[PDB]
XYZ file of C-alpha atoms in Angstrom:
144
model
C 0.000 0.000 0.000
C 1.301 3.420 -0.998
C 2.957 5.587 1.618
C 1.288 8.940 1.893
C 3.206 12.148 1.097
C 2.184 13.534 4.500
C 4.369 12.254 7.325
C 5.550 12.944 10.865
C 8.979 13.060 12.495
C 9.460 12.321 16.202
C 12.903 13.265 17.530
C 13.355 11.093 20.624
C 16.129 12.087 23.024
C 17.184 11.636 26.650
C 16.529 14.627 28.902
C 19.472 13.816 31.182
C 22.178 13.023 28.604
C 20.631 14.818 25.586
C 21.603 11.842 23.416
C 19.368 11.212 20.400
C 17.878 7.835 19.471
C 18.795 6.885 15.900
C 17.305 3.899 14.071
C 18.751 1.995 11.107
C 16.253 1.665 8.261
C 15.612 -1.726 6.674
C 15.049 -0.429 3.134
C 18.224 1.708 3.271
C 20.725 0.326 5.807
C 22.838 3.484 5.409
C 19.834 5.589 6.505
C 19.725 6.300 10.244
C 16.801 8.376 11.460
C 14.432 9.266 14.260
C 10.881 7.882 14.216
C 9.093 8.604 10.933
C 5.821 7.527 9.384
C 2.965 8.567 7.145
C -0.174 10.266 8.441
C -3.144 8.069 7.581
C -6.548 9.171 6.337
C -8.755 10.518 9.106
C -5.794 10.764 11.498
C -4.055 13.889 12.766
C -0.311 14.470 12.864
C -0.121 14.081 16.680
C -2.176 10.885 16.414
C 0.200 9.502 13.783
C 3.217 10.565 15.848
C 2.012 8.668 18.917
C 1.110 5.669 16.749
C 4.514 5.492 15.050
C 6.321 5.860 18.383
C 4.283 2.942 19.729
C 4.654 0.832 16.575
C 8.320 1.483 15.765
C 10.006 1.790 19.190
C 7.339 0.213 21.446
C 6.921 3.332 23.602
C 3.357 4.006 24.781
C 3.367 7.753 25.416
C -0.125 7.692 26.930
C 0.673 4.756 29.220
C 3.955 6.251 30.458
C 2.402 9.736 30.720
C 5.156 11.045 28.471
C 4.697 14.342 26.634
C 4.862 14.411 22.837
C 5.894 17.974 21.984
C 4.359 19.434 18.831
C 7.228 21.475 17.396
C 4.800 23.493 15.231
C 7.206 23.041 12.311
C 6.370 21.643 8.879
C 8.843 21.152 6.031
C 8.666 19.757 2.503
C 11.461 17.804 0.836
C 12.132 15.696 -2.233
C 11.543 11.998 -1.620
C 14.797 10.118 -2.169
C 14.881 8.703 -5.692
C 15.641 5.174 -4.467
C 12.712 5.367 -2.012
C 10.043 7.053 -4.186
C 8.758 3.652 -5.356
C 6.641 3.328 -2.194
C 4.602 6.447 -3.083
C 1.720 6.848 -5.505
C 2.630 7.428 -9.169
C 3.839 10.971 -9.757
C 4.436 11.696 -6.056
C 7.879 13.223 -5.479
C 7.326 15.729 -2.632
C 6.714 14.910 1.036
C 5.478 17.206 3.806
C 6.809 16.423 7.282
C 5.571 17.650 10.666
C 8.075 17.668 13.528
C 7.547 16.354 17.056
C 9.850 15.823 20.028
C 9.774 13.168 22.755
C 12.077 13.643 25.752
C 12.614 10.433 27.685
C 13.771 10.761 31.311
C 16.813 8.590 30.576
C 18.291 6.515 27.803
C 16.687 3.091 27.613
C 16.802 -0.197 25.784
C 14.626 0.102 22.667
C 12.597 -2.794 21.250
C 12.251 -1.870 17.567
C 10.091 -3.669 15.017
C 10.612 -2.149 11.544
C 14.289 -1.148 11.863
C 17.548 -3.095 11.861
C 19.156 -1.510 14.930
C 19.209 1.530 17.196
C 21.952 3.666 18.693
C 22.089 6.533 21.193
C 24.354 9.328 19.943
C 25.082 12.865 21.045
C 22.940 15.427 19.233
C 25.700 16.712 16.891
C 26.708 13.158 15.954
C 23.101 12.080 15.404
C 22.466 15.114 13.196
C 25.595 14.450 11.133
C 24.752 10.744 10.787
C 21.265 10.964 9.271
C 20.863 11.355 5.518
C 17.617 13.334 5.949
C 18.254 17.079 6.047
C 14.931 17.641 7.825
C 15.914 15.105 10.493
C 19.228 16.930 10.895
C 17.450 20.277 11.248
C 15.006 19.028 13.887
C 17.791 17.622 16.072
C 19.824 20.823 15.757
C 16.894 23.158 16.425
C 15.058 21.153 19.110
C 17.779 19.178 20.929
C 21.072 21.024 20.474
C 19.594 24.473 21.165
């Protein structure tokens, strides 16, 4: 089923250490990222953010009474050529809404759709990802 060109980004980090959680994608093993996912029909960006966090990293924000911060930032970028196949014919642009999720500490992550995870300092995490929007969110909402 086609991914939708409306997505969310959840930058997860540790409040105490400020390290950022980076996940290794299965479709592009050189692509490390925060939590990302499409916004489904009839679902809001915050709803999709909490769903992806629960589906990808097994973190129930409602159960743990965590706070998903709406960054009130939306960006549009070109879908990577080698990844555009998952989108409807003709779709090349993707709009991404940013969210932040500050965990009290670093923790073991049980991922489902990624190959591995790694806690890195904000500058390192930003320099590691291939997504410029993911870099910008870490810099603007974790480093500063």
